[model samples]
Target: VEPPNERSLQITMNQRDNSLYFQLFNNTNSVLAGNCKLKFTDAGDKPTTQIIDMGPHEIGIKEYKEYRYFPYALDLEAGSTIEIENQYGEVIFLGKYGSSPMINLRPPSRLSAE
Candidate 1:
């Protein structure tokens, strides 16, 4: 029997700007080919979608690829959501931006108070 196809997707917000980055990985022994969709929804309930065409290109086995979208930048405000779907219309990744930080907070240290 053949092994099942496995894949992974990651999304990250740009600290320098409102843009977002995407990373797609193929974890199986076979190649991954086809177009994928990326959808973003802002706090105002507006939606923006983009399509990535793979064409004759393919993601090699155990390899990963990178992509960037929203050249004009996106509003990743609280209540905003991002989603990615494969050619089969299956969601590969889904995430929501929250009001709170994902990491621990640290207080700023003051050396001298003038």
Candidate 2:
């Protein structure tokens, strides 16, 4: 369970081989440390999800900020829509409540694009 409150993150889209890449992160001390549930929906209108066990242990300070990174194996297409969902899993604390980017991508050199 993710407590009574859940943290939100920004979803960033970038040009990558004509596809989009995603990244999720948070930097806050208030967030509890524990496992997290992650889900992603792709352009095909299909949804993929995974339960990531994070911070059964972690380290940070209330006086400072800490961050955790969520990784991805992209399934995308042209005009493929993407969204982040946490309703399927859980996080220990979900972090304090600060600014974080949810999705990021690197543009690929011209090559694979039908």
Candidate 3:
């Protein structure tokens, strides 16, 4: 069960096709009720909204889980950003958009372990 007051939400960008994946992290072992939503803002400052549509997937205490897939890659300018918020209008995650379509990934940990 989650604690009386600890909640988290996040979004990760998939580099392959530039789509979005989402997660809800509940610190408590108990279930937390609420839906999540996303807002994509472009360089022009125009905002587009979408419902998270992901699971209130049972998150064990202090555990984090992500949704399978969120279709539709966003096509926005370099200065754009993605915003995710909880049902209560509290901001959860903010992602900066890179101008380039290609995103860099870190090398395997094995290479850095040496």
Collision count for each candidate, in order: 0, 7, 7
- Return the clash pairs for model 3, or none: 1-28, 1-29, 1-30, 2-28, 2-29, 2-30, 3-28
Candidate 2's residue-wise lDDT over 23-113, tens digit each? 3444332442334332333444453442233334432332222332234445444433333223334222221111323333111222234
104, model 2: CA deviation in Å?
A: 11
TM-score of each predicted structure versus truth: 0.45, 0.30, 0.39
Candidate 3 residue 54 Cα shift, in angstroms, is: 4.6
lDDT tens digits, residue span 32-67, model 1: 555656554553376455344433455666576666
Question: Residues 1-114, candidate 3, lDDT per residue (tens digit)?
Answer: 433333333334442264554443444435444465545454336535534543343335556555534454665556445554556665445555565532222211222221
Which one wins on TM-score?
A: 1
Cα lDDT, all candidates: 0.48, 0.33, 0.45
Off by over 4 Å in 3: 1-10, 15-19, 22-34, 40-47, 58-62, 68-77, 99-114
RMSD of 3: 11.2
**Where does candidate 3 have its weakest 10-residue lDDT segment?**
105-114
Error of 2 at 96 (Å): 21
Query: Which scores higher on TM-score, 1 or 2?
Result: 1
